[PDB]
Design a protein around this ligand. Structure first.
Ligand SMILES: Nc1ncnc2c1ncn2[C@@H]1O[C@H](COP(=O)(O)OP(=O)(O)OP(=O)(O)O)[C@@H](O)[C@H]1O
Ligand SMILES: Nc1ncnc2c1ncn2[C@@H]1O[C@H](COP(=O)(O)OP(=O)(O)OP(=O)(O)O)[C@@H](O)[C@H]1O
Ligand SMILES: Nc1ncnc2c1ncn2[C@@H]1O[C@H](COP(=O)(O)OP(=O)(O)O)[C@@H](O)[C@H]1O
Ligand SMILES: [Mg+2]
Ligand SMILES: [Mg+2]
Ligand SMILES: [Mg+2]
Lengths: 166, 523, 365, 46, 50, 487
């Protein structure tokens, strides 16, 4: 509709519909970043819709790559993506983006990150999907029953000379 | 249908690692700064680079390989093209020469490209975490920046750069490959053993998957040492022009200048200051101008440069050292006296500077860095000219700056915040590292069953990105952050410091001394 | 096989100091080739040249290993068909050699199985070792602040009359005598009497059993020798050590005294070769010469070479290009200061300016 | 004062020598690179 | 060698009117085969020591 | 041989950035521009500038681009004159290079006239006497070394002392409201710094793409070969000269860095067969710089206010290049690294600065008297500082300690936060009026503020800001006392 201009005043392509379709056809969410890279190279900066699609692919994708990658985390990738969007692109995440993050936290069983995201949605957005808040609490209380509330080695009593400093 | 080369003359003279050519009458002729092949055998060729074109028709050649095979009278063929080397993701995890030949271990990019235009760049706004608290706070580095590392021999110039490469391993594994930081480590005039030791060190931490090594050892001719930085940056410009970020380390430019001096003098170039060629500034100037932060319109990729430079007796008045300092956007000065004084990394904050400023810091680090900067400034002056708050916290900040391995962002920022808000005022300076170790690798609240926080715990490594988004001084994270620090301080003082201050036995004293020294090398 | 240029005949065209130009009608032999002067010239000893540059397709510039006295133009020269080769193997143990590999101990013939050229390529990356361990010397300063590494490279930087030679002898007595492997002593531009004293010392200690098995080889090109010899004796000594390391997988000690004279010798010839001097007056190829030499002094997967090199600092100026460039080629650096010695402190090590690579808790306790 | 004066008078002597040496090295390099051409004179007329 | 020289001569348009001549040179670097050079165009069909 | 336009020559020698050209009909005049018409498979055109005549047919030249892919005997065609650059109001808001070609990717520029970059300097009779103070909004400059309109200003400094920052502050304070035009010449400096300047100027509306701009940019930077860095200054100066003469306007001329012009010529000097002079600069160092500097002057037609940044290599002001530039300036601002290391910005050493208009006839008597008193007090304070280290502060007399206490306040009161260094400092900048600076310092000298805390003068503007900071300091101190009292 309205032409966008870049930092130096040159115009940027705004027709970012085909790229979203490409993102919605990926198998592993690392391939989504490649699409974002191609968009930037083609002077087609992503919009809010593009980032949400990327988050959706991350949540719905099996893994980062065809082969496993050590210490890979879906939550970390999405949060970094949001950091890029808000800080280095000046775009405010909407409710949809945070919901995807909350779904990932619930799905992965990380019930402590869910609490933080729950407050974020209750602070920036308007509340949280009460379906997901309840799911996270269920995961937390399962840990209490099973005893996996904190890593066990932390609970072990220690002393001044009883700590192994690697 | 023949593989017809372009013969341009014969080899006239050979002087070490350089040669001269005489053109055969009535031949096409060779172009300046092009690659030529000296036919050492009907099937074997030695690479050379054109450097001079004299009135007599004679040609100055810089030999690159198979020098021992070169003899006077051999034929020379002209490719007619500049130097191009392999580039791509298929080179990562490998050791290569400036010519692209792989070195066994136990797309073509032009090496003479021009730097990005003025309107092809963007302001530096993305941080590059070295992993060291001193640098990340007081000497910010941003992607697309040239940060010199100047110091004396045996001061940590190589270690800090290698640690910076390693610190990206953990980050790259979690975030998308879009924001991953690739590494090009260039060794110039170094020992072959050191390269192997570096290769093993990178492999141990798994950094080879995101890193490649370009080596021109001492035994190799000066030509390779002269082209290594240009070849290395070329491999890093592949990612820059494709919306990705790279980090190029040059170890070190000091030995590159010597090689260029050797080549110029042998080829009858007039010497200049300290016998260096007149155009020695222009050599590094065009090398470091190629490291930039491309604009949104060209992809947003970047190349970050960490050239290393050696001084003699902490003399930064030398020729090449001054030239490089007048080129880079900042300098990290490693001081010998601090290094021997126990401060490691021996970063001299007074002599170090980053011209990018806070723009190359994350929103979370800006507030901590800004306030930390004022305290240290007062601390430097107070002692130079009384337990005032600036002097109480300044010493503890200095103690927290001693490190041996790069630190995760979450661990470093939290510790700095604690020391900033006075949580370490009651902690003795000697025990600061021990306090930090327990905070990071332990949780006193859980140990003593007094932890009421819901999510904020130091063992939840995923909190790093939430901190990096919202800041520590935000209502989401601030309330629980203070509670955890308050509990950790109270528990630490009560259960640990009291016993530590009550030790008199020689056996216990020695045991404590070992513990605290180990804590320095652990966190 | 046999070289295609052996027996090639050339004539002397120009003589300046130790630098001689030779014109070959059929074509100049390859660089580094060895040539023998055939004309009698009334000399008392033979004359040998080593090619270092090619002036044209027929003319080649060379350095003489002996004095060029009584050398006329048009003198006849014959190629030897290869580089300067020296004996290798156990036959050399217990013997004294010169730059050319000729025994100078006035004893029986060496009878070596074979010879190998002095100039050789260095070990590659894949042939490098990864073993770090402490060599106990018995000296307090070294073992504490700058411990030495087995199979590593050690340098003793010092002025004149500071204690470089004394420390080397102490290390020899405390290590070499009680050493399972072999030892090679390379004297380069040092006092001839010191070599004689060392030879007597090694005979008394029975490290050289004239009638039995010996563990030490001596290679000596001393101050009196012309610059050509002093620039190649180190190569020959290193070649013997390389053979022991690789062809036998045996640990070797390499005591070089003094390595600075090697660079000084190349500087003297470079001035005559017609090259523009670098800073101070040294040859522009100072770094490359050291790199080629030092990179050969390393421990591979086949064997180990522990090298101890004495470095002379001219005018007590540690910033001189020669010693300055050598720091990067050493695992351990031992800097000696004249003022410390004048205070009665021996050894005069300045610990603040010393360094070691194995000063790592992962290696030492 | 007697030890820092000697190092100041020793430094000025070295500084003068090195700067002059540099200049002469460049002078000799530009002289060496120069080559005399064929002499176009009446050689026979002699 | 003559056949190769003629083929190279045909390819070169500048030497269309020029008359072909062959000059033999002895190279000790090649043990077998031959090479042909014409107006800078060099064709190698030779082998040396293995 | 009058009109050499289209004359043909052949490349005879190529060594680095220096190329020798042979003309059968005679070498064109020196400073002539030549184009390499031969198709060498280059990505950029190659142009050369004649600098010397080796004989009646051979000429030595410096290239403006890289000499890669250049062969011998390559054809070369003269352009019929020296290097020409566009001039006029149509260049406003645009970025140019040494050759006068736009590099902003903003479309063709409508040029009605072009002028050669090499021109003869004004003669003695073309000199105008303009003694008027220039208010830069900086306490140190306006007081100790006031600037003069239509004059020449130098910022001598090492690396990292704040030369570029001061230039940015001067632009923000003098150029935004300038009646006339401005020309910025980047010479052998970082390319990113030029980019930041372009963005800031667009934001400040100095360069109005849609409207009317009032500044020109000419950039030859480090990446460029020495040939370009030795002529970019001439190109920008030519644009300013046109605005001065033809348009009769008062123009600003910022140059950063002028040293690179000397450095580039030294790099090529070796290959031109010239014996190096002392340190290692070219023998023509003084003459080449003088010709350029004399062109940068205010004549009877118009005025050029020139601000030039000089790099003092290794903080050695005895170096030939910095020293040679001191006699070609009307106001010198010498920056010192020691001052900066102490937290004082701008790191000006007032004892080493000087100004031509520091005379009572030009400036007000109060201004002259205040400045001299400040300088004398600073001089005396430095002598006392030697005593204070040997004897100690206790031994100083009553008079001496009053000098010490007053002088320390002067040292800290000279510091000022700039509006462009907010990221570096983290505080808003201040613009101090000339009258406020004089009154504030006058009161300080006579002890009107002896009871004010010393730190109240640190990184503030006028006297009013000093009082406010002191009040804030008092409040926080009272809070700390209250907290201690409760304990
Ligand atoms: N942060 C550190 N803490 C403790 N030791 C360190 C640290 N950084 C480096 N070192 C040690 O200091 C020594 C010198 O380090 P390094 O190899 O980085 O020096 P350098 O600057 O490369 O010197 P050079 O290359 O000239 O030898 C090594 O033993 C290294 O392990
Ligand atoms: N460890 C030591 N203990 C006592 N005296 C020593 C010691 N080392 C050296 N000296 C004294 O210093 C003198 C010179 O020592 P040394 O022969 O080692 O010199 P150097 O370093 O080899 O110098 P150069 O070979 O250039 O003469 C000795 O003769 C002796 O008087
Ligand atoms: N007014 C100032 N306030 C604070 N720091 C400053 C100021 N001016 C300069 N600096 C320091 O100097 C750096 C910029 O140096 P710069 O202006 O480029 O100097 P130069 O061009 O002389 O090297 C800043 O990053 C900061 O560290
Ligand atoms: Mg290093
Ligand atoms: Mg000795
Ligand atoms: Mg600057």
């Amino acid at each position: 509709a309205a032409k966008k201009y870049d930092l130096f005043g040159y115009e940027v392509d705004t027709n970012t519909a085909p790229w979203i379709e490409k993102i919605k056809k990926c198998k592993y969410y690392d391939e989504a970043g490649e699409v974002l890279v191609n968009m930037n190279v083609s002077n087609c900066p992503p919009d809010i819709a593009t980032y949400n699609a990327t988050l959706q692919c991350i949540y719905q994708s099996p893994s980062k790559q065809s082969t496993p990658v050590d210490n890979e985390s879906k939550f970390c990738a999405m949060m970094d993506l949001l950091e890029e969007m808000q800080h280095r692109n000046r775009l405010k995440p909407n409710e949809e983006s945070w919901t995807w993050v909350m779904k990932e936290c619930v799905k992965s069983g990380q019930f402590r990150l869910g609490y933080c995201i729950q407050q974020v949605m209750e602070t920036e957005c308007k509340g949280c999907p009460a379906d997901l808040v309840k799911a996270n609490e269920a995961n937390a209380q399962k840990a209490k029953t099973e005893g996996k509330e904190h890593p066990g080695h932390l609970s072990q009593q220690a002393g001044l000379f009883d700590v192994k400093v690697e | 249908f023949f593989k017809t080369t372009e013969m341009i003359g014969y080899v006239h003279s050979i002087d070490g690692t350089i040669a001269t050519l005489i053109p055969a009458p009535g031949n096409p002729g060779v172009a300046y700064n092009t690659i030529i092949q000296i036919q050492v055998s009907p099937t074997t060729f030695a690479a050379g680079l054109v450097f001079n074109l004299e009135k007599d028709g004679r040609i100055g050649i810089i030999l690159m390989d198979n020098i021992t095979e070169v003899q006077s009278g051999q034929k020379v063929m002209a490719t007619g093209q500049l130097l191009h080397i392999p580039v791509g993701a298929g080179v990562l995890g490998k050791v290569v020469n400036p010519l692209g030949h792989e070195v066994p271990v136990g797309t073509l990019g032009k090496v003479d490209t021009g730097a990005p235009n003025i309107v092809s760049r963007s302001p530096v706004n993305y941080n590059l975490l070295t992993g060291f608290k001193a640098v990340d706070t007081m000497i910010p580095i941003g992607r697309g920046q040239r940060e010199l590392i100047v110091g004396d021999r045996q001061t940590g110039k190589t270690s800090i750069a290698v640690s910076t490469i390693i610190n990206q391993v953990r980050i790259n594994q979690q975030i998308l490959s879009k924001n991953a930081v690739i590494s090009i480590y260039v060794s110039i005039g170094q020992r072959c053993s050191n390269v192997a030791r570096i290769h093993r060190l990178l492999q141990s931490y798994g950094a080879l998957r995101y890193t490649t090594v370009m080596a021109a050892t001492a035994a190799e001719p000066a030509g390779l040492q002269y082209l290594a930085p240009y070849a290395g940056v070329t491999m890093g410009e592949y990612f820059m022009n494709r919306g990705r970020h790279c980090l190029c380390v040059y170890d070190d430019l000091s030995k590159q200048a010597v090689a260029y001096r050797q080549i110029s003098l042998l080829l009858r170039r007039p010497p200049g200051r300290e016998a260096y060629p007149g155009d020695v500034f222009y050599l590094h100037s065009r090398l470091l101008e190629r490291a930039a932060m491309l604009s949104p319109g060209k992809g947003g990729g970047s190349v970050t440069a960490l050239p290393i430079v050696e001084t003699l007796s902490n003399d930064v008045t030398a020729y090449i050292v001054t030239n490089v300092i007048s080129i880079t956007d900042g300098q990290i000065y490693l001081d010998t006296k601090l290094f021997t004084g126990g401060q490691r990394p021996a970063v001299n904050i007074g002599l170090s500077v980053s011209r990018v400023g806070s723009s190359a810091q994350n929103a979370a680090m800006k507030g901590v860095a800004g306030k930390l900067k004022g305290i240290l400034a007062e601390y430097r002056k107070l002692a130079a000219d009384v337990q005032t708050i600036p002097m109480i916290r300044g010493a503890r900040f200095v103690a927290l700056f001693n490190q041996k391995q790069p630190s995760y962002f979450m661990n470093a920022i939290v510790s700095l915040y604690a020391c900033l808000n006075g949580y370490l005022d009651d902690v003795k300076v000697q025990y600061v590292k021990f306090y930090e170790y327990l905070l990071v690798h332990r949780d006193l609240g859980i140990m003593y069953g007094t932890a009421k926080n819901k999510f904020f715990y130091m063992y939840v490594q995923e909190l790093n990105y939430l901190i990096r988004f919202f800041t520590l001084n935000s209502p989401i994270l601030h309330g629980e952050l203070e509670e955890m620090l308050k509990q950790h301080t109270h528990l630490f003082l009560q259960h640990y410091q009291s016993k530590m201050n009550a030790i008199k036995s020689e056996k216990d004293v020695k045991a404590l001394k070992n513990l605290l020294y180990s804590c320095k090398r652990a966190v | 096989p046999v070289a295609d240029h052996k027996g090639r005949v050339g004539h002397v065209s120009q003589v300046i100091g130790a630098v001689v130009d030779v014109h070959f009608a059929d074509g100049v032999p390859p660089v580094l080739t060895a040539l023998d002067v055939v004309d009698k010239l009334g000399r008392d000893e033979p004359l040998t040249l080593e090619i270092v540059q090619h002036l044209d397709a027929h003319t080649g510039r060379c350095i003489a290993m002996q004095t060029t006295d009584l050398l006329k133009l048009k003198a006849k020269v014959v190629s030897t068909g290869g580089n300067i080769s020296v004996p290798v193997g156990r036959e050399t143990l217990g013997r004294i050699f010169n730059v050319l590999g000729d025994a100078i101990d006035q004893r029986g013939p060496v009878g070596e199985k074979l010879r190998m050229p002095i100039h050789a390529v260095a070990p590659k990356l894949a042939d490098q070792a990864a073993e770090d361990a402490v060599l106990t010397t018995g000296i307090k300063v070294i073992d504490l602040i700058l411990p030495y590494c087995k199979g590593g490279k050690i340098g003793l930087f010092g002025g004149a009359g500071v204690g470089k030679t004394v420390i080397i002898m102490e290390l020899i007595n405390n290590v070499a005598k009680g050493h399972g492997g072999f030892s090679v002593f390379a004297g380069v531009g040092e006092r001839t009497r010191e070599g004689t004293d060392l030879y007597l010392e090694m005979m008394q200690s029975k490290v050289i059993d004239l009638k039995g098995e010996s563990k030490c080889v001596l290679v000596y090109g001393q101050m009196n020798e012309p610059p050509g010899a002093r620039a190649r004796v180190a190569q020959s000594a290193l070649t013997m050590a390389e053979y022991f390391r690789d062809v036998e997988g045996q640990d070797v000690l390499l005591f070089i005294d003094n390595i600075f004279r090697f660079t000084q010798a190349n500087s003297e010839v470079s001035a005559l070769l017609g090259r523009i001097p670098a800073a101070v007056g040294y040859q522009p190829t100072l770094a490359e010469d050291l790199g080629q030499l030092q990179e050969r002094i390393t421990s591979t997967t086949k064997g180990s070479i522990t090298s101890v090199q004495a470095v002379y600092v001219p005018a007590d100026d540690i910033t001189d290009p020669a010693p300055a460039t050598t720091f990067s080629h050493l695992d351990a650096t031992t800097v000696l200061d004249r003022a410390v010695a004048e205070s009665g402190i021996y050894p005069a090590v300045n610990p603040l300016e010393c360094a070691s690579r194995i000063m790592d808790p992962d290696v030492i306790s | 004062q007697q030890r820092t004066s000697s190092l100041y008078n020793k430094t000025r002597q070295f500084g003068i020598t090195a700067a002059l040496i540099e200049i002469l090295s460049a002078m000799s390099s530009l002289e060496g690179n120069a080559m005399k051409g064929v002499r176009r004179n009446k050689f026979w007329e002699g | 060698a003559r056949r190769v020289a003629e083929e190279l001569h045909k390819g070169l348009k500048e030497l269309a009117d020029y008359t072909l001549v062959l000059k033999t040179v002895v190279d000790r670097t090649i043990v077998k085969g031959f090479a042909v050079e014409l107006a800078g165009q060099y064709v190698n069909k030779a082998e040396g020591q293995q | 041989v009058a009109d050499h336009k289209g004359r043909v020559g052949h490349v005879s020698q190529v060594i680095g950035a220096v190329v020798d050209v042979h003309f059968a009909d005679g070498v064109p005049p020196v400073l002539t521009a030549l184009d390499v018409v031969d198709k060498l498979g280059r990505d950029e055109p190659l142009t050369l500038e004649i600098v010397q005549h080796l004989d009646a047919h051979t000429g030595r030249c410096i290239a403006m681009q890289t000499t890669d892919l250049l062969k011998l005997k390559a054809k070369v065609v003269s352009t019929g004159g020296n290097i020409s650059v566009p001039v006029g109001r149509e260049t406003l808001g645009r970025i140019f290079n040494v050759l006068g070609d736009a590099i902003d990717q903003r479309g063709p520029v409508g040029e009605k006239l072009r002028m050669p970059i090499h021109a003869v300097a004004p003669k003695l009779a073309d000199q105008a006497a303009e003694d008027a103070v220039l208010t830069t909004g900086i306490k140190v400059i306006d007081l100790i070394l006031p600037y003069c309109k239509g004059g020449k200003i130098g910022l001598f400094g090492g690396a990292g002392v704040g030369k570029t920052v001061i230039i940015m502050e001067l632009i923000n304070n003098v150029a935004k409201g300038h009646g006339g035009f401005s020309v910025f010449a980047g010479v052998g400096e970082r390319t990113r710094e030029g980019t930041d300047l372009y963005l800031e100027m667009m934001q400040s509306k100095v360069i109005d793409l849609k409207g009317e701009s009032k500044c020109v940019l000419v950039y030859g930077q480090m990446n460029e070969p020495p040939g370009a860095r030795a002529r970019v200054a001439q190109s920008a100066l030519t644009m300013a000269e046109y605005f001065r003469d033809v348009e009769g306007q008062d123009v600003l001329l910022f140059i950063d860095n002028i040293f690179r012009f000397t450095q580039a010529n030294s790099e090529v000097s070796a290959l031109l067969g010239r014996i190096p002079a002392a340190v290692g600069y070219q023998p023509t160092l003084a003459e080449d710089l003088g010709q350029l500097q004399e062109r940068i002057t205010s004549t009877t037609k118009g005025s050029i206010t020139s601000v030039q940044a000089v790099y003092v290599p290794a903080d050695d002001i005895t170096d030939p290049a910095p020293a040679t530039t001191f006699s070609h300036l009307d106001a010198t601002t010498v920056l010192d690294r020691a001052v900066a290391e102490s937290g004082i910005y701008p790191a000006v050493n007032p004892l080493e600065c000087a100004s031509r208009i520091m005379d009572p006839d030009v400036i007000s008597v109060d201004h002259y008297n205040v400045a001299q008193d400040v300088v004398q007090m600073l001089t005396k304070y430095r002598e006392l500082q030697d005593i204070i280290a040997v004897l100690g502060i206790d031994e100083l007399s009553e008079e001496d300690k009053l000098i010490v206490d007053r002088a320390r306040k002067l040292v800290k009161f000279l510091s000022q936060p700039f509006q462009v260094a907010e990221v570096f400092t983290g505080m808003t900048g201040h613009y101090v009026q000339l009258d406020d600076t004089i009154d504030s310092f006058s009161g300080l000298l006579m002890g009107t503020y002896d009871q004010v805390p010393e730190m109240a003068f640190y990184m503030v503007g006028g006297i009013n800001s000093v009082l406010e900071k002191a009040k804030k300091m008092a409040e926080e101190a009272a809070e700390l006392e209250k907290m201690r009292r409760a304990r």
